[PDB]
Amino acid sequence: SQIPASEQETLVRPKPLLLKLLKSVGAQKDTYTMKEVLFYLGQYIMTKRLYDAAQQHIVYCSNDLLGDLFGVPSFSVKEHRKIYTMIYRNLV
Numbered sequence: 001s002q003i004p005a006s007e008q009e010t011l012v013r014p015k016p017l018l019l020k021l022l023k024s025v026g027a028q029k030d031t032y033t034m035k036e037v038l039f040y041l042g043q044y045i046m047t048k049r050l051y052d053a054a055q056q057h058i059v060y061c062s063n064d065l066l067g068d069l070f071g072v073p074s075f076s077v078k079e080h081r082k083i084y085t086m087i088y089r090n091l092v
């Protein structure tokens with residue numbers, strides 16, 4: 001609803017370090033839809049416990065490969081456009 005379905009359903013090619021992060025949570029291809037990139041990023045965040053019960057909508061990614069890719073120590077999962085922009089920086 002923040003991001004149009006057509007944009008979510010577009011095939012993208014992750015840059016190599018984003019691909020490394022996706023491959024770490026079982027993703028086995030060179031290209032994905034934006035929606036699949038976001039799914040695997042979700043799986044990664046939940047696996048590495050980059051969250052906190054005190055602030056349940058904040059990803060805490062400082063000193064993690066995710067924080068290096070996105071250029072921030074933390075971000076809000078409610079800011080979908082800002083998150084898409086951070087992912088576009090990591091697509092070929």
Ligand SMILES: CC(C)(O)c1cc(F)c2c(c1)C(=O)N(Cc1ccc(Cl)cn1)[C@@]2(OCC1(C(N)=O)CC1)c1ccc(Cl)cc1
Pocket residue numbers: 038039040041042043045046050051052056057058059077078079080081083084
């Ligand atoms: C626990 C916490 C921090 O409140 C969290 C942690 C958490 F991992 C997620 C979310 C929320 C969430 O809402 N999600 C979906 C999402 C958000 C933004 C955009 Cl634009 C799209 N998709 C996340 O995924 C959900 C899951 C999945 N899809 O498998 C793990 C189950 C999520 C995914 C990617 C990024 Cl970059 C951020 C959040």
